[PDB]
Amino acid sequence: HMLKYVGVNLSGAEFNSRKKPGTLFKDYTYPAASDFSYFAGKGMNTIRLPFLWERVQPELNGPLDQAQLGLIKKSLEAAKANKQYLILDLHNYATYSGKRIGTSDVPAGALADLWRRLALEFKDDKAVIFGLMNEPNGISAPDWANAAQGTITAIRKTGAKNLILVPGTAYTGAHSWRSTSYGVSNAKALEILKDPGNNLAFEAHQYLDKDYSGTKPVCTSDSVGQEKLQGFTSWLRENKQKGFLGEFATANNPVCDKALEGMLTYMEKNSDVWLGWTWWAAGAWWKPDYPFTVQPGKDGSDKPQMAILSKYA
Numbered sequence: 001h002m003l004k005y006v007g008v009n010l011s012g013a014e015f016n017s018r019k020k021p022g023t024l025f026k027d028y029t030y031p032a033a034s035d036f037s038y039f040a041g042k043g044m045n046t047i048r049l050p051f052l053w054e055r056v057q058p059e060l061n062g063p064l065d066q067a068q069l070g071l072i073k074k075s076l077e078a079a080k081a082n083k084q085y086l087i088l089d090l091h092n093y094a095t096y097s098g099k100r101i102g103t104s105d106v107p108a109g110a111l112a113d114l115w116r117r118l119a120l121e122f123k124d125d126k127a128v129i130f131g132l133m134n135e136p137n138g139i140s141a142p143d144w145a146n147a148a149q150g151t152i153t154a155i156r157k158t159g160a161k162n163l164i165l166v167p168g169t170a171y172t173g174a175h176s177w178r179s180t181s182y183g184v185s186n187a188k189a190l191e192i193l194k195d196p197g198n199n200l201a202f203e204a205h206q207y208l209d210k211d212y213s214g215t216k217p218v219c220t221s222d223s224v225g226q227e228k229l230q231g232f233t234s235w236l237r238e239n240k241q242k243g244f245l246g247e248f249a250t251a252n253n254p255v256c257d258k259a260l261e262g263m264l265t266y267m268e269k270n271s272d273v274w275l276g277w278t279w280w281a282a283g284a285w286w287k288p289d290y291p292f293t294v295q296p297g298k299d300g301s302d303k304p305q306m307a308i309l310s311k312y313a
């Protein structure tokens with residue numbers, strides 16, 4: 001891989017998000033150790049690990065749940081053992097128990113407290129990357145940027161030097177990064193961020209179906225992925241920043257495979273600003289008909305898209 005960090009999302013800990021706390025192995029799961037070794041064997045050195053704010057911190061501004069933290073630490077041991085980096089993905093869409101950040105119920109400061117606590121736990125660890133928030137939405141780009149700044153600050157106040165992945169609002173889509181249709185763009189709002197630790201990258205997501213939601217197993221053309229990454233890539237370059245494609249996926253068909261090759265090659269050619277990517281998704285709890293799974297079969301076999309991802313790893 002020409003990019004620094006390449007891998008997959010190991011999805012499962014974020015499942016059944018309405019259930020709080022939920023029960024391990026019934027409502028959600030953490031990944032098997034064997035998942036980490038399988039992907040390591042494919043050349044992948046990075047795992048994005050979704051988990052829920054509500055499960056790791058059952059009361060806002062309160063102590064972390066030690067059982068939940070122990071599960072995260074167990075996954076970290078597996079990643080380290082397999083020479084992988086672990087992205088802690090607070091997989092919450094800028095909400096806590098259904099309420100948006102910025103409301104009276106969930107002040108921006110509550111997210112900063114969460115991250116202060118995780119940073120204190122993981123600061124002495126080079127394998128750990130902090131994924132501040134999965135797909136913020138329902139919040140303006142300036143407001144989200146204020147929340148993100150508060151969180152970066154809280155992390156750095158602990159002495160933590162770990163890489164922080166910072167998303168925008170609008171589900172952090174690469175394609176819409178520069179859009180001013182509805183007001184201030186992610187591009188404009190996030191220009192003012194400061195990281196006194198100088199170890200930040202911007203996380204974008206990109207799907208290739210008609211509304212870029214990953215709702216359908218269709219790629220609208222054989223070049224749409226690379227096309228949708230261009231604006232964001234230029235913004236990174238303009239601002240001397242790095243980027244990370246925290247989620248992307250393509251279905252198993254010829255037009256999608258071409259689009260996937262094109263977007264992976266595009267990020268390789270633009271590796272001055274692309275730090276890496278993590279495919280959505282693997283993990284043991286996807287049904288076999290889920291169009292984007294790269295979880296190996298019960299029979300040990302590789303999924304179709306893995307043959308392409310492995311080439312770029």
Ligand SMILES: C[As](C)(=O)[O-]
Pocket residue numbers: 134135213214247280
């Ligand atoms: C896999 As998603 C687009 O809900 O972060």
Ligand SMILES: C[As](C)(=O)[O-]
Pocket residue numbers: 213214215249280
């Ligand atoms: C969470 As999805 C819309 O990429 O299956």
